[PDB]
Amino acid sequence: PIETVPVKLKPGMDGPKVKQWPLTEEKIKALVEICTEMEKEGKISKIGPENPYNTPVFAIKKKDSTKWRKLVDFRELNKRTQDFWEVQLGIPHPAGIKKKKSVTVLDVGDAYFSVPLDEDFRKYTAFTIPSINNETPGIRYQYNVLPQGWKGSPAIFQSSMTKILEPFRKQNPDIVIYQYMDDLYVGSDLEIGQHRTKIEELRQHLLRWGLTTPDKKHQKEPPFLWMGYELHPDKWTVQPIVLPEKDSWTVNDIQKLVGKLNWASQIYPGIKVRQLCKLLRGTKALTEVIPLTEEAELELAENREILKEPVHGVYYDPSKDLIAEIQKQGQGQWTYQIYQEPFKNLKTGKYARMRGAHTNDVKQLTEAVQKITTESIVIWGKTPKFKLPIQKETWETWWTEYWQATWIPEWEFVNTPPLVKLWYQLEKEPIVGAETFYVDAGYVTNRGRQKVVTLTDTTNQKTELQAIYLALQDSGLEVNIVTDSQYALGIIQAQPDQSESELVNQIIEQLIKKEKVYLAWVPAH
Amino acid sequence: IETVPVKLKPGMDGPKVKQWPLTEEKIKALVEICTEMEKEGKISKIGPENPYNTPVFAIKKKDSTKWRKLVDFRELNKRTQDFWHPAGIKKKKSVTVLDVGDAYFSVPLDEDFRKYTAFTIPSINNETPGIRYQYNVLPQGWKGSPAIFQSSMTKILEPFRKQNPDIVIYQYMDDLYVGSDLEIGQHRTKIEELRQHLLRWGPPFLWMGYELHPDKWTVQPIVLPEKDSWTVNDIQKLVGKLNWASQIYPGIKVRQLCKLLRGTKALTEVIPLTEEAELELAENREILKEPVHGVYYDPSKDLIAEIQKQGQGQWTYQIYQEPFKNLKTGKYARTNDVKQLTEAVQKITTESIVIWGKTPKFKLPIQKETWETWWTEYWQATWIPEWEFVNTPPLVKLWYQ
Numbered sequence: 038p039i040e041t042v043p044v045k046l047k048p049g050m051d052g053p054k055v056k057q058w059p060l061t062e063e064k065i066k067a068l069v070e071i072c073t074e075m076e077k078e079g080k081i082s083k084i085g086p087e088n089p090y091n092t093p094v095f096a097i098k099k100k101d102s103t104k105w106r107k108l109v110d111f112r113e114l115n116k117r118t119q120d121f122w123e124v125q126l127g128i129p130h131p132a133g134i135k136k137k138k139s140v141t142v143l144d145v146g147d148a149y150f151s152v153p154l155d156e157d158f159r160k161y162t163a164f165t166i167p168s169i170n171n172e173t174p175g176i177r178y179q180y181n182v183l184p185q186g187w188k189g190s191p192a193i194f195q196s197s198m199t200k201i202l203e204p205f206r207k208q209n210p211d212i213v214i215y216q217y218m219d220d221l222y223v224g225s226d227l228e229i230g231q232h233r234t235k236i237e238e239l240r241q242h243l244l245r246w247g248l249t250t251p252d253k254k255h256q257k258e259p260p261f262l263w264m265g266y267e268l269h270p271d272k273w274t275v276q277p278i279v280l281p282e283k284d285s286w287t288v289n290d291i292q293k294l295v296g297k298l299n300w301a302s303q304i305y306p307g308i309k310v311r312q313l314c315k316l317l318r319g320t321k322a323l324t325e326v327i328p329l330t331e332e333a334e335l336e337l338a339e340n341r342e343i344l345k346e347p348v349h350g351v352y353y354d355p356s357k358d359l360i361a362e363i364q365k366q367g368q369g370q371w372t373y374q375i376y377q378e379p380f381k382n383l384k385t386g387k388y389a390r391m392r393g394a395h396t397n398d399v400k401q402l403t404e405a406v407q408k409i410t411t412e413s414i415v416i417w418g419k420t421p422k423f424k425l426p427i428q429k430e431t432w433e434t435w436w437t438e439y440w441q442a443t444w445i446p447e448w449e450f451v452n453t454p455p456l457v458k459l460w461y462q463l464e465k466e467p468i469v470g471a472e473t474f475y476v477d478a479g480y481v482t483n484r485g486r487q488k489v490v491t492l493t494d495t496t497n498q499k500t501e502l503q504a505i506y507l508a509l510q511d512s513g514l515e516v517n518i519v520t521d522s523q524y525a526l527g528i529i530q531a532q533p534d535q536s537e538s539e540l541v542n543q544i545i546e547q548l549i550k551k552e553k554v555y556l557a558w559v560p561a562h
Numbered sequence: 563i564e565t566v567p568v569k570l571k572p573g574m575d576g577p578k579v580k581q582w583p584l585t586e587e588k589i590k591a592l593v594e595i596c597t598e599m600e601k602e603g604k605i606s607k608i609g610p611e612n613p614y615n616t617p618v619f620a621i622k623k624k625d626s627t628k629w630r631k632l633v634d635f636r637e638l639n640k641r642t643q644d645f646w647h648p649a650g651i652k653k654k655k656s657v658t659v660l661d662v663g664d665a666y667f668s669v670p671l672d673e674d675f676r677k678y679t680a681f682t683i684p685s686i687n688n689e690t691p692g693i694r695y696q697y698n699v700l701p702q703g704w705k706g707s708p709a710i711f712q713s714s715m716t717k718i719l720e721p722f723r724k725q726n727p728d729i730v731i732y733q734y735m736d737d738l739y740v741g742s743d744l745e746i747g748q749h750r751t752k753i754e755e756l757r758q759h760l761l762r763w764g765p766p767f768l769w770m771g772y773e774l775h776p777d778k779w780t781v782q783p784i785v786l787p788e789k790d791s792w793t794v795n796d797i798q799k800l801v802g803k804l805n806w807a808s809q810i811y812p813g814i815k816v817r818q819l820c821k822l823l824r825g826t827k828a829l830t831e832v833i834p835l836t837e838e839a840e841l842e843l844a845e846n847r848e849i850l851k852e853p854v855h856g857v858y859y860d861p862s863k864d865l866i867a868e869i870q871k872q873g874q875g876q877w878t879y880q881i882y883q884e885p886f887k888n889l890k891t892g893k894y895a896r897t898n899d900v901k902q903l904t905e906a907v908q909k910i911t912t913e914s915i916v917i918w919g920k921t922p923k924f925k926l927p928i929q930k931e932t933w934e935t936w937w938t939e940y941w942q943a944t945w946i947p948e949w950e951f952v953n954t955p956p957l958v959k960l961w962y963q
């Protein structure tokens with residue numbers, strides 16, 4: 038009994054005109070009973086031959102029930118129907134919700150069928166029920182409400198829905214509602230009974246609009262296994278995950294395992310999959326079998342142990358501040374956890390993202406802070422005070438001297454090894470009394486020294502780094518190195534401390550070893 | 563009132579742009595703002611049948627404790643039909659910038675366009691669907707607005723224009739640039755009056771409320787280290803710099819310098835310079851003393867703007883249309899990086915407007931996620947330039963300042 042939403046077909050398009058599949062007399066019977074049931078309920082109505090449009094219908098029974106069910110294939114109509122505002126793909130994360138005293142799930146029965154369809158649009162929803170006898174033709178109808186499976190259906194519905202609640206809502210600032218598809222989660226802090234009572238109030242508010250809902254005795258009870266998590270009104274966790282105890286693992290198995298493991302990491306700290314992931318290298322078939330390594334099985338067992346003991350996330354307490362803490366779990370790995378009260382976790386997580394072929398902890402660390410911030414703003418519309426294993430001086434140093442602009446919010450140094458530091462720094466001016474190496478796969482020094490080495494299967498870019506490596510190698514604790522390679526200059530000036538290029542890493546090693554190193558660039562010819 | 567029929571460029575459809583998530587503080591501010599804009603029938607809540615969207619942000623007024631609703635009409639402005647500049651302004655001594663945005667709201671928007679102006683007030687953790695509206699009047703930041711309001715504008719402005727033709731006034735989007743050569747004392751007064759002379763019909767000060775002083779804007783020439791003693795290193799840097807700049811000023815010769823560099827000498831070894839070298843530097847030094855000749859502003863081309871992080875809160879920018887063909891170069895010094903960067907951008911954009919009445923396509927030395935995270939935190943302009951993100955080469959940074 039609510040405002041109907043105005044619809045239109047995509048521009049320059051006519052309604053769908055597609056032939057009805059030849060049905061069975063058996064199915065024709067069922068359909069007529071259903072469409073009649075429906076026409077007396079107003080959702081559909083017979084139409085004149087005026088209408089030339091048509092959409093295929095068919096009969097399928099209920100699942101595990103020996104009862105017929107009408108289905109309408111709206112693919113074509115939907116191909117022609119205008120687009121709508123997005124049925125939000127945005128899903129709330131548990132760590133962002135606040136505890137309630139009680140909560141309730143209200144399943145909306147006959148959702149779509151409780152809402153009207155733009156009258157000027159109904160015609161397009163035409164379909165036919167074939168006759169059993171030849172020159173005794175079959176029934177033409179059209180939809181008056183919202184057909185399941187239609188484009189707008191979910192959108193329009195979800196909309197009206199909110200419009201309806203808006204009222205109730207306003208006169209119940211106390212209560213909290215969240216609508217998801219056909220369910221309505223409703224929690225409050227009302228004492229047991231008062232809560233149960235207000236639900237009905239609501240249940241009625243909806244009733245006034247023909248919105249049928251389940252009674253107390255038929256409603257679902259906490260916890261609520263919501264896409265990945267179990268939701269009690271005051272605590273949460275993830276969907277119970279036990280690790281198989283196989284002795285033979287297939288590529289696919291491992292993939293599935295890693296995926297699962299990943300999921301869990303958002304809450305279960307210390308979950309690691311580096312070794313298991315390693316198992317994929319060179320694999321040739323989703324059904325190939327890979328034996329476990331001592332580090333892989335160790336890891337498996339260690340994760341298996343971690344999962345054994347269940348954990349439960351806490352809810353958002355907006356009155357408190359949210360603290361985010363980060364740790365370097367391994368080369369390239371970072372773990373973090375956010376909380377308002379010590380160890381009382383809202384959410385946890387890892388960060389392995391490597392942006393660029395070469396990086397340093399500082400750059401990497403920073404990138405993680407960013408990730409976190411983004412998340413926060415999204416789940417809580419606020420950013421956390423960070424706890425970081427690095428000292429300002431360190432940060433500031435790198436910062437100030439990096440070519441790209443950057444920014445980190447309020448953060449506090451936490452002395453929690455391993456601390457992130459800079460393993461080396463390029464001198465900012467030439468070193469007096471330090472041998473000067475001129476490179477181009479070979480070098481020459483001011484002291485007569487030289488070596489023109491041999492490199493095979495080496496790329497242009499790779500030949501340049503080599504020379505420099507060489508230079509570092511034969512030189513003493515202080516070196517000045519002159520090169521024409523802007524590339525290398527770049528790579529190194531960024532003072533990376535990890536790279537997935539083996540050569541680099543070596544050089545990096547050299548650098549850390551030296552007392553003072555100066556790198557300079559000069560043109561080619 | 564009589565609404566002028568507006569339309570998108572042929573075949574183009576409306577914007578369907580994602581809304582960057584906002585902080586609760588911002589959100590609330592926007593709810594409060596739009597709620598009142600609704601009561602005034604400026605905007606209206608919309609329905610599912612509207613698939614369009616444009617991003618919304620809340621910025622803080624300069625030395626004002628209120629918020630301003632900012633709308634990223636970039637995508638739309640680009641798709642809107644084309645509706646159909648005082649060089650004297652850039653010479654003016656003083657120019658004040660005002661925000662005339664609120665005028666637009668007195669004029670209704672063509673009903674059949676309104677839908678394209680749809681935007682959304684996001685919900686934390688998607689706990690809520692998100693509040694959607696569209697505009698009923700001319701919306702701030704929409705290129706259409708100034709055009710469609712031009713007429714009424716000129717009208718309320720012809721008096722001052724002739725009652726004070728010693729003042730130049732330019733209108734760009736929601737902003738009014740009032741130039742003059744008066745004494746800063748006189749200027750500020752004449753500005754205020756204009757304000758009431760507008761109150762008369764339809765304006766807090768923009769850009770610190772403060773002034774601008776175009777007359778004093780100058781080009782940052784390429785420089786060379788002047789120094790007492792010259793070491794091999796110094797010279798190497800020199801030549802490197804020189805060679806680069808020779809692609810702009812071809813008259814630059816390095817010949818003699820390069821010769822002081824024969825031999826694999828030690829980097830710190832000081833090199834006294836020859837006579838030919840000395841003069842070669844001088845000549846080069848002389849060539850750089852001014853911007854390269856020939857470069858002219860082409861209205862039919864995009865105004866590009868690149869920035870470099872120097873350090874110590876110092877930045878370098880260059881405005882051009884064709885590589886090496888710079889229309890202007892400058893310097894910016896102070897906070898934190900972003901803040902600084904945004905202030906650079908805004909500052910730079912203003913100049914572009916004042917000078918070539920247009921906004922530039924920036925190239926920022928930063929990471930999207932980060933920029934998207936903070937820019938609104940310091941932004942105060944009423945317009946938003948187009949921008950892209952890049953990775954500055956260590957050499958270029960070196961070749962400037």
Ligand SMILES: Cc1ccnc2c1NC(=O)c1cccnc1N2C1CC1
Pocket residue numbers: 129134135136137140213214215222223224225261263268269270271689
């Ligand atoms: C799935 C979901 C999404 C958003 N909020 C909630 C829920 N479900 C809950 O079970 C829940 C648990 C605790 C507090 N609020 C909750 N609710 C709020 C509505 C009462």
